[model samples]
Target: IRTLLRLVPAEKRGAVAGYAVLTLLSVLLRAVGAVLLIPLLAALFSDTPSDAWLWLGWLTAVTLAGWVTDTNTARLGFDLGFAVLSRTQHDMADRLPNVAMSWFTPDNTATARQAIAATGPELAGLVVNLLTPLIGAALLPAAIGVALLFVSVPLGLAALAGVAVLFGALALSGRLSRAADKVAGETNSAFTERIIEFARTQQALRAARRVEPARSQVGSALAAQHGAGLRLLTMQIPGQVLFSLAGQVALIGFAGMAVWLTVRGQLGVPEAIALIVVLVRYLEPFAAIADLAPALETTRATLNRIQAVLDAPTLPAGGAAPSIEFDDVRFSYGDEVVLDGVSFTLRPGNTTAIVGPSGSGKTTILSLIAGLQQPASGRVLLDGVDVTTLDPEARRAAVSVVFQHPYLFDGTLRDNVLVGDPEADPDDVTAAMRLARVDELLDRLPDGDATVVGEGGTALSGGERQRVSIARALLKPAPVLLVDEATSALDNANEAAVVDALTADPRPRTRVIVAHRLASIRHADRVLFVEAGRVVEDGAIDELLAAGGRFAQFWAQQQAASEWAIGST
Candidate 1:
C-alpha cells in the first residue's frame, strides 16, 4: 500500500497533501470537541459561573463545524480514493498484456484481479482505521490525559493504565489478523473462479441437461465464500468485544479512583470535576477505535493480496520501433520447441514466405517477429539494434500482425477500421478493402462504414472478419506487415485478393506470411521450409521444387491434393 502510492505523480502529491490536511482538520475537530469537555465541566460546576449559554453556544459551534468538516473531507476522500482506483486499474489493464506471457496463465490472471479489486477495502481500511483513528483516537487521549495531570496526578496515571490495557487488547487482536486475512483472500479467489466457471459452463450444462447440478456447484462455492467471510468476522469479534469491555471497565475504575481522591480531600472539588470530564473525553476516541478493529483485520489481509500483484515484475519493456529482424532465434513453450537456431532477414522491398507442414512454427515465428513474444535465445533486432531493449510501444508501432482469426470490436465498419490507427487515410482504407475483395461487403451492408460489426465479428462471416482485419492493418500500413495464416481461412478469390494487396510491390514496406496453403506462397520471393523447429530447406519455390528435397515432397503433396479437389469439382 505504501509503495502503490508512488504511482501518484509528484506533481499530484499536492492533492494528497491537501487531502491529508482536510482529513487532519476533520479529525482535529472531533478530537478538540471531545477535549473541550474538561473546560466546559470546570465552568459548569464552579461558584457563580453563570456561563451556561456560552458553553451551549461553544458546543453547538463545535458540533456543527465538526459535521461540516467531516462531511467535506469524507467526500474528498471518496473522490480521491476512486480516482486512484480508476487510474490504478487503467494502468494495470494496459500493463497486463505487455507483461511476460508466462505471467498470463490462469493462476496469474486470478492473482491480478484479486490484487486490483482489493484496493477498495484496503484503502478504506488504511484511511479510516489507520489514518483517522491514529490521529483522532491517539491525540484526544493524550490531550485529555495532560489536562487530567494538571487536575489530579493520580487520576491521570489511572487513565494511562487504561490506555495501556486497551492497547494490549489491540495487540492480542492483531495476532488473529493475518491468518484470518489469508483465509478470506483464498476464499475470494475461489469465489471468483467459481463465478467464471459457471458463466463458461452454462452452454455445456444446458446441452447436457445438467444445469441444476452445475448451479449447485456455484451455490456451494458461494456458501463457502460466505462461511469464510463469516468465520473471519467471527474470529475477530471476540477480541474486539474483549477490548471494548476491558477498556471501558478500566475507564470506569479510573473514574471511581478520581471520586476516591476527591473524598480523601487530596483533589479540590473543581479539579475533581475536571478530572472526571477529561476521563470521559479520553474514553470516546478509544471506544470508536474498538468498533473499527474488524475491518482493519480484513483489510490488512486484502492489502497483502494486492501487494503481491503490484510487486510482481511487469514485462521487460523494450522493442525496436520502425524496424525488425530475427537473428538465430530459438523459442519454445515448455517441451514443445518452435524455432530452433532458425534465422531470417526481413529487409524492406521484399516478400518473405514461411511455408511448411501444419505443426511448423510459422505462426510462432511471425508472433516473435511482431514483438508479441521474446525469443528464448538469440535476438530479434530492428535497425540492427536488438528489439528486446527498445520501448515496447515503439516496437508495436513499427509492425502490424494479422492473425487467422482477428477480432472486431462492437462498432461501425469505419469505426473498426479507423480504430486501429486513428490517423489512417479513408482513401487508403477504400483501396485496401477493394484489394481484399471486401468492397462488395461495404456496399452491401446497410450503412457502409457505419455498419456495426457485432462482438467478435459474430454478425459477419469468417472471410469478412478476416478482410476487416486486413483493412485495419492496411489502415495502419506498418513498415513490416506480418500475416499468420492470412489466406488459410479464405476461399481462393478472397485469398488471391488479400495476397495481392498484402504483397503488391513490397517497396517501402515488407511482408512475412505464414502459408498454410502452398498456393498462397507462389508469389513469395523467398520460401522457407520449416520442420521440427528448424528451417531444413530455404530458397525460391521453383528452386526448392527442383532440388527434390523436403520442400519438393511437401509441394508435390499440396499439388496432388489440389488436383484431387479439382477432379471432384
Candidate 2:
C-alpha cells in the first residue's frame, strides 16, 4: 500500500485528503439518518400526532442528505483515482524509454504489458470504489458505539464486542485463504502467459502436429485455476458465514439490550429504538466491507506487481554525439561471451562494414555503439567522451539504424518516416522517399504517402518495407547511420538504388553496415572480418583481398554463391 501511495505526486495528495474527508462526512450523515429514526419511532407510540409528522419530515430530510453525501463522495473518489492512474501511466511510459533496451526481452515485454495495461487500472478502481467504504465500515461502527454509550454503558460495550467479533472472523478468513489466493494468482498468471504463447505459435504447432500437447497444457492450467478457486472458496465461505452470524448476534444483542434497558427504566423507548436502528446501519456497511475481501486480496497482489516495475533499476543517461570507438570492450550473456577484447574506431565521414558468419557478434557491436547495451569491462567512447557519461537521448540521436527487418507501426507511410524526425521538413521527407525509391510505393497505394501501413507493414512487400526504412534513416540525417543487412529483402534493382542513394548523400557522417553479401561492402572504406567473437581481419577491401587472408576466402565463397545458377551446367 505504501509503495502504491508513493507513486502519487505530492501535489495530488491534497485531493486524496479531500476524498477521505468526504467519505467520513458521508458516513456521519448515514449515522445521523439512523439516529433520526428514534424520534420517529417515539412519536408513533405517543399521543402527539403532530410530533410524529415532524419527526417523519426530519427523517426524510436526513435520508436525502445522506444519499447526497454518498453520491458526492463517490464522485470525488473517481476523480482522485483517475489522477493516480494517469500519473502511473505517465511514469511508466517515461521510465521505459530510458531503460536498457535489452530489458525488453519477449517475456519481459509480455509481463510488462499485462502489468501496466491490466493491473494498473484494476487497482485504481479497487482503491476508488472500495477504500472509502472499508474505512467507513470501521469508523461508522465506532461512531454508533459512542452513541450507544450515551444511551447506556452496557449497550455500548456490547456493540464494541460485536464489532471485535465481526472483524476477527474477517481477519481469520483472510489469513486462512492466503495460501489458496497466492496459488490462484500464480496459476492465473501462468494461464495468461500460456494463452499468449499458444496464440503466437499456433501456426508452428499446427504444422508440427504438436497442437494437442500445448492444448493439454492449457487444459491442465484451466483445471489448476479451478482447483485454486475452490480452495479459496472453501476457506472464504466459512469465514463469510462466521461474519454473517456475528452480525446477526450483534443485532440480536443490541435489540435485547435496548429492550432490557427500557424495561429497567434506564432508557426511553424512542432512544432505545434509535440505538437499534444505528446498530443495523453500522453492521450493514461492515458486512459490505467483509464481502470485499476477495477483491482486496486481488488488488493487493496487483499493486505488488506494479511496484516491481516502478522499482526496476534504470540506465543512466549519456552525453554528446561524437566519433564512436570501442576500447577493449568485452560483453557476455550469462556464461557465453559474445564480444571479447573488441577494439575498433568508427571515424566520422568514413564507411565501415562488419562482415562475419552467423553468430559472429556483429549485431552485438552495433548494439553497444547505439548505447542499447553496455560493455562488461571496457569503454565505448563517442569523440573521447565515455558513452556512459553522455545523455541517453543524445546518444540515441547520434545514430540512425535500419534493421534487416524494420518494424513499421500501424500508421501512415509518412507517419513511419516522421518517426525518424517528427519535426523534419516535408520537402526533406519527400526527397528522402524519392532517393530510397519509396516514391515507387506512393504510386501503388491508394493514398500515396498518406497510406496507412498495417501493423508491422503487413500491407507492403518486404522490399517496399525496406525502402521505407531507408527513407526513414535518410530523414533522420543523424551523424551516424547503421544498416544491418538493410538490402537483404530488396531485389537487385532496389538494392542498387538504395546503395546508390546511400553513397550519393552529400552529408558527412560515419556509416556502419553489417552485411553477409560481399557485393554490398566492396566499396566500403574499411571492413572488419569477425570470427567467433574476435576480429580476425580489418582493412580496406582492396588491401585485405590482396593480402589473401580470411577476407579473400570469404569473398571467393560469396562470389561463387552469387554466380551459381540452377541446372545451368
Candidate 3:
C-alpha cells in the first residue's frame, strides 16, 4: 500500500489522505446503518412499540451520509490518480534524455512502453478502484469486532476470528499462486514483444518469404501466454472458493454465538440482534475481497514491473567539452570488438572526413565523440579533459550531430529548428536556414517556413529532412559538428549547395564528416581511411592520392563508379 501511495506526488498527499478518510467514514456509516436494525427490531417487539420515527430518521441520515462520502471518495480517487499519471508521464519524458543511449533499443523501448503505457495504468487502476475498498473491507470488520467486545467478549472474538480466517485464506492463496502469476507475467511480456517485433519486421519477413514461419512463432507465443493465464486462474480458484466459504462459515458462527449468549440471559435481546446484524455487514466486504483476491496478484505483478523501470540506473552526468581526442579507445558489442585501441586527435577548427566501408567503425567514432556512447577502455577527451569527467551540460553544449536519417517531429518548420537552440534569435534562425539551404526548400512548401511537417517529416522528401536537420545543427552554438552521411539523399546541386554552406561557415568550429562520396570531401583539410576499426591512412586528399595507398585505391574505385553509364556498361 505504501508502494502504491508513493505514486501520488507529495503535494497531493493531503488530498489522498482526505480520500482515505472519506472511504473509511463511508464504511463505518454503512456498518452503523446495519447496527440500527437491532433497535428497530426491538421497538417493533416491545409492548408499547414506542414511535419508531426517531430510529428510522437516524438510519436514513447515516445511509445518506455513507452515500455522500462514497461518492466523494470516488471523485477524489479519480482526480488523484489522473494527477499521478500526468506527473509520471512528465517524469519519464524528462528522464529519457539522460538515460543511456543503449537503453533505447527496440526491445528495451518496447518493454518501457508496456511499463509506462499499460502496466502503469493497471497498477493505478488497482490503487484507485480497489485499494480503498480493500482497506475498508479489512478495517471496517475490525472496527465492528472492537465495538462487539463491549457488547460481549465471546461475540467479539468470534467476529475478529472470522475476519482473520477470511484474510488468512486470501494470503495463503496469494502465496501459493505467486509462481503461477510470475510465469503468466513473463509469458505476456514475451508475447507482447513477439507481436511488436512481427509488426515491425513484417515487410522484411514477407520479402524473405518467411512471414508464415514468423506468424507461427507468434501464434506459439500467444498460446503459451494463454496457457500461463489459465494456470494462474486454476491456482486462484481454490483460494477464492475457500475465502468465500470461510466468510460464510464465520458469519454463521457469529450468529450462533450471539443466539447462544442471548438465550443464556447473559446478553440482551436487542444487543444480540445488533451483533448479528453487524456480523452480516462485515461479511459483505470480506466476501467481496475474497472474490477480488486474483486481482491483487495481477496488480502486484504489474507494480513490480513498473518498479523495475523506476529503479533503472541513469547515466552519469559529468563531462567536459574540448577538442575531440581518442586516446587508445576501445569499444565492443559483446564479444565482437568494433574499435580496437584506435587513437586519433581531431584538431579544433579542422574539417576531417572519415571514409570507411560499411561496418568499419566510422559511425561508432562519431557516437563516441558525441557522447552517445562510451568506450570500453581508454579515454575520449575534449581538449585534454576526459569527456566522462566533464559536466553533462557542458558536454552537450559542445557538440551538435546530424545522423544518416535525420528525425523530425510533427510540428512547424520553426519548431523543428528551435530544438537546436530554443532561444535562438530570429536572425540567427534565418542565417542557419540559408546556410543549410532550407531557404530553397521553403520556397516549394505551400506554407513556406510555417509548413507543418507531419510525423517524422513524412510529408517532405529525404533531402528536405536532411536540410532541416542540418539547419538545426547550424543554429546550435557548438564547437563541434558531426555529420553522418548528411547529404547522401541530396541531388548534385543540393549536395553541392549544402557542402559549400558548411565549408563557408566563418566560425572556427571543428567539423567531422562521415561520407561515402569521395567527391564530397576532396577539399577536406584531412581525410582518414578507416578499415576494420583502425585508421590505415590519414592525410590531405591530395597527399593521400599521391601516396598511392589504400586511400588512392578507394578514390580510383569511387571515381570509376561515378562515371559508369548503363549504355557504356
Candidate 4:
C-alpha cells in the first residue's frame, strides 16, 4: 500500500488521503453497527418495552449508516482507481525521457513493459477487490474486540487475547506462503523468458533444423515451472490451513468463555446469545482476509517493480552546448575495470576523435560525456556542472548521439528523424536527410519516406539504421554531436560520402567521434589515443603524427590494414 501511495503524484495525494479517510469511516460504522446488537439484546431481556424499542431504533439507524458509508466507499474506490491510472500513465510518459540512457537495457525494458501493461487494471481492481477487505480484516475485527471491554470485562479480555494469538498465526502463515511464492516466482520468470526467447529465435532455429529441439528446450522449462507450482501449493497448504485453524481456535476459546460466563450467573444469557451474533460479525472479516491473502504477494511484487522504475536516478539528457569535462573519472563493472583515472576536457565547437584498440574504452568516453552512464567514481561535468546534480535540465537540446549500435522506434522514416527535434522545420528535415545520405533509404524502400521501419529498425540494414540515426542527430539543432562508428556498416564509397557530409556541417558545435576507421576521424580537430585504461596521447592529428608516437603507430597500422589486398599466398 505504501508503494502504491508513493507512485501517486503530490497533487493527487489529497484525493488518496480522502479515500483512505472514507475507508476508515466505513470500517468504523460497520464496527459500531455490530456492537449495537449487545445493548439491544440486554434491553429486550430486561423486559423494559420502551428501553428495548429505543435500543432497536439505535441499531436500525447504525445499520443504515453502515450500509450508506459502505456504498459511498466503494464508489470512491473506483474513482480513486481511475485517478491513479491517469497519473501513472502521465508519470511513465514523463519518466522515460528524463531517465538516463543506460536505463533502457533489454532487461529493464521488458520489466517495465510487463509492469506498465498491468498497472492500470491491476491497481484499479485491487482498490475495491483487495484493499477494502484487507483494511477491514486488519482493523475492523480488532476494533470490535475493544468494544467488548464495555459489554463484559472478563469476556473482552479473552476476546482481545484471542485476537493477539490469531494475529501471530496469520503472520507466520504469511511468511511461509511468501517464501514458497518467491521460489515459484523465479521459476515462472525463467519460464516466461525462455518462451519469449524461443519465439524470437524461430528464424535462426528453423534455418538450422533446430526448431524442434528449441521447442523441447522450452518444454523443459515448462515442466520445471509446473513442478515449482506443485511445490508452492504443497507449502501453501500448511500455511492456509494454519490461518483457518487460528481463526477456528479463536472462536472456540470465545465460545467456551461465553458459556462459562453465562453459567456463572454474573453474566446474563441474553448477553451470551448476543456474543454469538457478534462473533459471526467479527470473524466474518477475517474469513474474507484468508481468501484475500492469495492476491497480496502478487500485488506487492508489482508495486515493487513500479517503484523501482519511478525512483531510478537520472541525469539531464538535454542541455546547452556545454564545455565537457571528465574529472579523474574511474569506471568499472564490479572487478573488471573499463577506464581508470581518465580525465580530459573538450572545448566547445571543437571536434575530438577517440581512437584505440577494440576493447580500450573508446565508446565509454562518449557515453559519459553524453550522460548516458555515470562513472563509478569522480564525476562528469557538463559546462562545469556535475551531471549527477542536474535533474530539471531541458532534454531536446542535449548532446545528440549516433550510437555504434543504433536502434530506431517502429515508426516511419520521417517520423523517426523528427524524434530529434519534434518542432523541426520541413526544410531542415530535408536538409538533414540529404546530409546524412538518407536518400539511399528513400530510393530503395518501396514506401519511400513513408515506410514503417520495423521494430529496432529491423526492416532496414545496419548501414540504413546508422544513416537514419545520423539524420536524427543532424536534424536536432543540439550543440554537441557524438558519432560512434556511424560509417562502419557502409561500403568504402558510401563511407567516404557519409564522412564528407558529417564534416561539411557549418554548425559550430562540440563533436566527439569514437571510430576504428581512419576516414571517420580524418578531419578531427584533435586526437586522443587511449590504451590500457588511460589516455596515452592527446594533440591535433598532424601534431600527433609529427611526433611519430603511439598515435602515429596506430594510424600506420590501421592505414596499412585498410589497403591490404586479399590474394592467395
Each model's Cα RMSD? 6.8, 5.6, 5.6, 5.7
Candidate 2 local distance difference test against the native: 0.77
How displaced is residue 15 in candidate 4, in Å?
4.8
lDDT of each: 0.70, 0.77, 0.77, 0.78
What does candidate 3's lDDT look like per residue over 494-561, in tens digits? Answer: 57645854586655788899988865687588888899999999888889999999999999998898
> Roughly what TM-score does model 2 have, to 2 decimal places?
0.75
Compare the candidates by TM-score and give the number of the best one: 4
Tens digits of per-residue lDDT, candidate 2, 208-227, equal: 99999989988898777767
How large an RMSD does model 2 have? 5.6
Clashing pairs in 2: 318-390, 318-391, 318-392, 319-390, 319-391
| 10-129 per-residue lDDT for model 1 (tens digits) | 555666787677766766666557656666666778875676567667877988998887777666666566565666666666766657765566776787878676665556435534
Task: List clashing residue pairs in candidate 3.
Answer: 318-390, 319-390, 319-391, 320-390, 322-382, 322-383, 323-383
Candidate 4 lDDT by residue in tens digits, 1-569: 77777666677677677778877887787778888888777667665646878777877888888788788878877877777767777787688776866677687898788778877778777778878779878888888888888887877677777677777887888888788678778766866987788889889999999999888878986886677665444676776788888787777877777888788886787778778778767777777776777788678888777877887667643234578888889887557888989998988777888888777888878887776678889998878877666554443356788887767888798999999888999999888888888887799988888788976553677778878888888888877788887575345644654585558766777888887888778888888888977999999999999999998998899898877777832
List the candidates' TM-scores in order: 0.68, 0.75, 0.76, 0.78
